[PDB]
C-alpha cells in the first residue's frame, strides 16, 4: 500500500524504515566557457537516504565522475541510486536492515525493486506524499560537503542533531518537513528566519542551529507562516480558516 497522510504514523512504530530520495542525483550547472558561451558542466550529486524514527542520514555523495563517458543518464542515475541503496543494506546486519524502503518518486520503484531481489523480506513502497527532500541541498553543510567531494564517499549525519533527546520521533520528522518545505517554498527567506541571530549557531556536529524549545516555538511559527502566506497568495484563500490537517497536508505534500 502507498504510504500517505492517512497511514504515515507508521514511520515511527519500530519496524525500521528507510526513505530514498534521487532528486539530486544528475545536477547541472550553468556557466560561460572560454569563449564567452554559455553552456551546463555536471556537477556532484547526492542520495538522501533518512531513517525517519533516528533521524540517521546516509548521504551518499554522487561524484560527476560517474557521468564521465556515458550515456541514456536519466536512466543511469535511477539505476545508480538503486545500486548504491542496495549496497548499504547489504553491508548492514540483519538487525539494523530496514523492512521497508520508501521512494520518493515511482520512477524509482522498479530500479530498486529489481536491486533489493538479493533481499526477500524488504519491502519496497512508493508514496502519495511529495515530500520536501530535495530542498536537503540547501542545507548549506550537505551541499557543501556534497560540492567538496572529489570522489565518490558517504557521510553520515543526524538530521535531527540532538532534538530526539527532548521530543518525539514524530514531532521531530513535523519539524524537519516543515523547514525543508520552507526552504523549498522561499530558500532566502527561510535561511534569513534561520540565520537572524548569529548568537545562536550550530554545533560541528549538527545541521541545524541550538535553538531552545521556546525558539523552535518562533522559528516554527515563521516557517509555517512564510510557506501559507505564498500559498493563500497563489489561492487566493484565508490561511486563518485553513484546519490543522490541511497545513499538515501541504507540509507533507499530500495530493
Request: proline share 15%; charged share 10%; no cysteine.
Given at each position: 500500500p502507498f504510504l500517505n497522510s492517512s497511514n504515515y504514523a507508521e514511520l515511527f512504530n519500530n519496524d525500521i524504515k528507510l526513505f530514498v530520495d534521487d532528486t539530486n542525483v544528475y545536477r547541472v550547472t550553468v556557466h560561460k566557457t572560454f569563449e564567452g558561451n554559455v553552456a551546463t558542466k555536471a556537477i556532484n550529486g547526492c542520495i538522501f537516504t533518512l531513517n525517519p524514527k533516528t533521524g540517521h542520514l546516509f548521504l551518499k555523495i554522487i561524484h560527476t565522475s560517474v557521468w564521465a563517458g556515458q550515456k541514456r543518464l536519466s536512466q543511469l542515475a535511477k539505476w545508480k541510486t538503486a545500486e548504491e541503496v542496495s549496497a548499504l543494506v547489504r553491508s548492514l546486519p540483519k538487525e539494523e536492515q530496514p523492512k521497508q524502503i520508501i521512494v520518493t518518486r515511482k520512477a524509482m520503484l522498479d530500479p530498486l525493486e529489481v536491486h533489493m531481489?538479493?533481499?526477500?523480506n524488504i519491502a519496497i513502497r512508493p508514496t502519495e506524499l511529495r515530500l520536501p527532500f530535495s530542498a536537503a541541498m540547501s542545507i548549506d553543510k550537505l551541499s557543501d560537503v556534497v560540492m567538496k567531494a572529489t570522489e565518490p564517499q558517504m557521510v553520515l549525519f543526524n538530521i535531527y542533531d540532538d532534538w530526539l533527546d527532548r521530543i518525539s520521533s514524530y514531532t521531530a520528522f513535523s519539524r524537519l518537513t516543515l523547514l525543508l518545505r520552507a526552504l523549498k517554498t522561499n530558500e532566502e527567506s527561510a535561511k534569513m528566519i534561520l540565520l537572524s541571530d548569529p548568537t545562536i549557531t550550530i554545533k560541528?556536529?549538527?545541521?541545524?542551529?541550538?535553538?531552545?524549545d521556546e525558539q523552535w516555538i518562533t522559528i516554527e511559527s515563521q516557517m509555517r507562516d512564510l510557506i501559507l502566506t505564498e500559498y493563500g497568495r497563489k489561492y487566493n484563500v484565508n490561511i486563518s480558516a485553513l484546519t490543522q490537517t490541511e497545513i499538515k497536508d501541504i507540509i507533507l505534500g499530500q495530493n
Open positions: 531481489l538479493d533481499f526477500p560541528s556536529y549538527h545541521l541545524w542551529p541550538s535553538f531552545t
